[PDB]
Amino acid sequence: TYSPEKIAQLQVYVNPIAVARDGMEKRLQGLIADQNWVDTQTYIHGPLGQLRRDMLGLASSLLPKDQDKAKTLAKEVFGHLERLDAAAKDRNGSQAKIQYQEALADFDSFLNLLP
């Protein structure tokens, strides 16, 4: 089980990951709608640039029975964000919208598994 002290440790990683989730829907969604590909790329590298470190550090801190699912879901989020960055470099708004939605779906799955 997750003790209170353990949960507090997990929260150090949760804090920036939750803000990242909020920022994807509040800010990145509108940059993509705006066909603003320069700032879409910067959003991924600045405001979301620590997501790989934080979500992997979180998943690696979980009880053994949950580490695998959490790592798998994190890697899905990273692959769709990678494809969203590629889409923006290519000015491909069709893929930028798809990859945004796909990244969010797996990001929500990752959050939902947390204790």
**Resolution in angstrom units:** 1.8
Contact status, residue 61 vs residue 10, Cβ threshold 8 Å:
yes
Cα angle vertex 83, ends 67, 107, to 5°? 35
Tokens for 54? Answer: 């934080």
Experimental technique: X-ray
Q: What are the CA-CA distances from residue 35 to residues 31, 50, 52, 81, 100 (Å)?
A: 6, 24, 25, 16, 13
* 17-40 b/e (C-beta count within 10 Å ≥ 16 → b): beebbeebeeebeebbeeeebebb
For residue 114, what are the domain limits?
1-115
3-state secondary structure of 100: helix
Whose structure tokens read 């949760």? 14
Q: Does residue 84 contact residue 44 with C-beta atoms inside 8 Å?
A: yes
CA-CA distance, 1 to 22, in Å (whole number)? 28
DSSP 28: I
**Tokens standing for 108?**
């929500």
The tally of domains found in the chain comes to 1
User: 21: domain CATH number?
Assistant: 1.20.120.290
Of 106, 103, 108, 17, which is closest to residue 61 (Cα–Cα)?
A: 17
Could you count the other beta carbons within 10 Å of the beta carbon of residue 104?
A: 17
Tokens of 11: 């929260």
